[PDB]
Every structure is written in C-alpha cells, then in structure tokens.
Amino acid sequence: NMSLENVAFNVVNKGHFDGQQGEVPVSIINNTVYTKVDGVDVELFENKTTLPVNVAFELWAKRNIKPVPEVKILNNLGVDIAANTVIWDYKRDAPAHISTIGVCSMTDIAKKPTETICAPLTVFFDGRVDGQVDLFRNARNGVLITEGSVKGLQPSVGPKQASLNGVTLIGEAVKTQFNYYKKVDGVVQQLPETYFTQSRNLQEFKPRSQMEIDFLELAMDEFIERYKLEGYAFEHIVYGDFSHSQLGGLHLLIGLAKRFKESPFELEDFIPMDSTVKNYFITDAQTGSSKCVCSVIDLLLDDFVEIIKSQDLSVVSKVVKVTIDYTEISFMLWCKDGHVETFYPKL
C-alpha cells in the first residue's frame, strides 16, 4: 500500500500516519513537501535525510509515537532494523535505520521479520505489540523490549528514560523503563551489568540525587571536602579549569551545567548524532579558554564518583573500560604519585 497523497492526508488530519483513507493535493519542491490549503501551499516536511524527499516524508509520518529506546541504546545493542515500525532519530532528523520491514515499499527489505532476509540482522522487537515477543522467540538475531516479565527469559532492567516524539523523559503517565533481551545466532544473551547515561541537557538540567543537589549548590572546595574527594582531580575533571588557553577537563555534563548557570559558553556539536559519549568544540565566553575536542558524558555524579574511586592509581596512564549504555566505553586515566591528574572518556 503506497500513496504520497494519502500519507499527506494522514499528516494533515491525524498528525502522523494513522492508516486513514483520504487524499490531499501535494507539491514536491526543493526537498520539501507542501500541501494546498484553500488555494495556497503550506509546508508539511523538509527533508534533512539522504533519502529521496517523498520516501523520507513517508518514513517520518510512520515513525513510532510511543516511548521508545533512545537511539544510542539501540546502536550500542547492535540493532540493525526494526520490526514493522520506524524509529525516527531526532538527533539526526532521519530514520535510525536504513531499511524497514513492512513499512514502506521503497525501503522494505521484507514484509515480516520471519522472512529469511532478516535472519542475520539484529531486529528490534517491541513486546508492547501483539505477537512481537513470540517473533523474538523465533528470531535468530534480535533485541526485545517489554514492560514486564517474559516467561523463561531473565531480563536486564534498562534506563529509566525513553524517547517520546523526540522528547527524552522519565514517564509518569506512561511507562519508559523497559526490560531488555537480546539473541545472537539463536542464543539468548546475558546482557552485562551497565551504568546508564542520564540524557539531560544543559538548559534544564535537574539533579537526580542529593550529591548532585550539593554539587550544584555548594562551592567547589566545600563539595570536595564534604564527599572526601581530595586527590581525585574533580577541580579539573568535573568543575573545569578556565585559567589557560586550552580549557582543562570539563568532561561531566553536570559540571557544564554548573558553569553555564553563571557564565555562558559555546558548544559546537560537530558530529550531531545520539551517542553515549559526545564530543564538543567548546569556547568559554568569559575567559576565552577553549578546547577542540572536549568529550562529555552525562553520568549521575554518584555513578561517576563510584567509577573513579574504583580504579588503581599506581600507573602514569592507562585505559579504563566502563560498561555504559550496554557498550564498553574507554576512559584514559592519568595519575601522578598516587593521585588522579585527569580521567576522561573517548568517543
């Protein structure tokens, strides 16, 4: 089933593709879809993807509008494709996956995940949709989310937050914390113990523990004393050092949030996509201190403190692996004389 004009009718009348019958007049010009409303053209969609404009329009209209896992989580779990839905990537304004199953005649590689062409792909299955748990049970490769127990399968508890129409949130009127399951070549995997990033943003950062409240409210020296952090280089790593040409440290989102509340700065997101670790070209407006590649992660401060306090500090430099968002993140740890000098993630 295909029809540009019917996709546009659904967008106009239902806000997204909803399977309704109808058609509206459509114009395509300069990667933009328009529809005619009382004699004039109104823009419905501007294509920012590398797909043809009318195809991208249809996949966007058919996006999943329930809370879904953030794209960084699906990527870290190796998801290739989704069963009978589109995960829209709002960080890239594009489909999270290249191909589809049972969504769109231009992009489908299959109608159902049970077709042979899907067996080697890691298919994303959504236990909230009837039949999909059983499709996972029969799939060779897959990732399954559920809201509850699955008989015979041990769950991994996922992050508290999920994405709902591009808004990352911890649901109160809707469930956003899923159980996760994964199969590789027919065999159910044990997913690793993992930390999770918190997916917050600078502008409306909110503390999620008493330590984070204290970090935002106390002066640096008072906080470090109260939590006994002498010798872990929080002054550099978390608070940031703005005294030299190259900006020192500043690798934890909460420290950017604290600075940003007193003093604005520029973050150039030069690889704009969803990932567990983000790299920014940062320029501090007050001092002129700057750094071309400043890796930034949003861990709960208590989690970051546990990680850094769980390392051996006896060697000048080494790689530290930390499971975060189900993937192995490498950190560089630099020490001198038994104390930390710096500790920072790599992307």
Q: Which residues are annotated as a binding site for uracil?
A: 291-295, 342-346
- 25 or 192: CB nearest a second copy: 25
**Among 97, 251, 258, 278, the one annotated catalytic:** 251
Catalytic residue check, 16: no
Catalytic residue check, 318: no
Least distance (Å) between residue 118 CB and a second copy: 10
Counting contacts by CB under 8 A, is residue 3 touching a second copy? yes
Residues 257-316 that bind a second copy (CB under 8 A): 264, 266, 268, 270-273, 279, 281, 283-290, 292-293
Residues with their C more than 2.5 Å from the N of the next written residue in the chain, i.e. before a break, are none
- 52 or 155: CB nearest a second copy: 52
CB-based contact 80:121 (threshold 8 Å): yes
Counting contacts by CB under 8 A, is residue 186 touching a second copy? no
Catalytic residue check, 97: no
Q: Treating both helix axes as pointing N-terminal to C-terminal, what angle do 4-14 and 53-61 enclose, rounded to 10 degrees?
A: 40
Q: Which of 44, 46, 129 is nearest to 84 (CA)?
A: 129
Given 62, 63, 97, 259, the residue binding a second copy (CB under 8 A): 97
CA–CA gap between residue 108 and residue 121 (Å, rounded): 14
| Bridge partners, 283 (sequence order) | 266, 290
Counting contacts by CB under 8 A, is residue 245 touching a second copy? yes
Residues 14-43 that bind a second copy (CB under 8 A): 14-16, 18, 23, 25-31, 34, 36-43
- 73 or 308: CB nearest a second copy: 73
Strand order of the sheet with strand 327-336? Answer: 317-324, 327-336, 339-345
CB-based contact 26:4 (threshold 8 Å): yes
Q: Which of 143, 144, 172 is nearest to 160 (CA)?
A: 172
List the catalytic residues.
236, 251, 291
